[PDB]
Amino acid sequence: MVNWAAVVDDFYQELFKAHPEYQNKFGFKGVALGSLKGNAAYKTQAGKTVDYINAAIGGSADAAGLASRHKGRNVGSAEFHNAKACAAKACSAHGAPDLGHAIDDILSHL
Ligand code: HEM
């Protein structure tokens, strides 16, 4: 199976390398990037992200509900366009399909 857990790890590395301040919104605020895998808050969040990717691919994802929840953290369209670029890099690094269509579905509600 596509190793979405590894893709997601590379996604967050890309995302917080380019936009370190985004990490302040998470329960692993302030944690060194090379230590995220040892942080309990990160382990839970990355698992949720992996679950959402599998739901989007499996056809059950609630993109409107995910967008609304991100709006609820003052995360919007600009951040998701940046996420699109970071996910494209993470997917390419693993020879995984791109997640641009799933991220566009979220963007359609932002
Ligand atoms: C590929 C794009 C992204 C996906 C698939 C995604 C996925 C998720 C999921 C599945 C959750 C958990 C929602 C739930 O528990 O109901 C979540 C929470 C969250 N996301 Fe994202 N996200 C993305 C990008 C971003 C970006 C760019 C930021 C900007 C900071 C961000 C900020 C947050 C925050 C702050 C939370 C709440 C974390 C907490 O409860 O501690 N997300 N996201």
Side-chain angles (χ1 to χ4, degrees), residues 22 25-26 45 48 66 69-70 73 75 79-80:
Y22 285 8
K25 293 187 169 182
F26 292 93
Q45 173 65 28
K48 290 187 175 195
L66 194 70
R69 279 164 180 84
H70 283 80
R73 309 289 182 143
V75 178
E79 290 93 335
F80 273 82

Side-chain angles (χ1 to χ4, degrees), residues 11-12 15-16 19 21-28 41 45 47-53 65-66 69-70 73-76 78-84 87 99 103 106:
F11 165 74
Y12 279 114
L15 186 71
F16 300 138
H19 309 279
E21 77 280 8
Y22 285 8
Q23 193 183 328
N24 293 333
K25 293 187 169 182
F26 292 93
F28 46 89
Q45 173 65 28
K48 290 187 175 195
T49 302
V50 168
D51 291 342
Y52 184 85
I53 287 165
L66 194 70
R69 279 164 180 84
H70 283 80
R73 309 289 182 143
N74 294 329
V75 178
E79 290 93 335
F80 273 82
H81 281 285
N82 297 151
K84 199 172 169 192
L99 292 165
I103 297 170
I106 300 160

Side-chain angles (χ1 to χ4, degrees), residues 27-94:
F28 46 89
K29 166 181 185 180
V31 177
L33 297 184
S35 286
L36 292 171
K37 283 182 193 178
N39 173 279
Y42 175 78
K43 287 175 189 174
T44 291
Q45 173 65 28
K48 290 187 175 195
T49 302
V50 168
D51 291 342
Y52 184 85
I53 287 165
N54 285 139
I57 295 165
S60 69
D62 175 20
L66 194 70
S68 185
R69 279 164 180 84
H70 283 80
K71 290 188 189 168
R73 309 289 182 143
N74 294 329
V75 178
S77 290
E79 290 93 335
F80 273 82
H81 281 285
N82 297 151
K84 199 172 169 192
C86 294
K89 296 183 185 185
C91 291
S92 186
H94 292 270

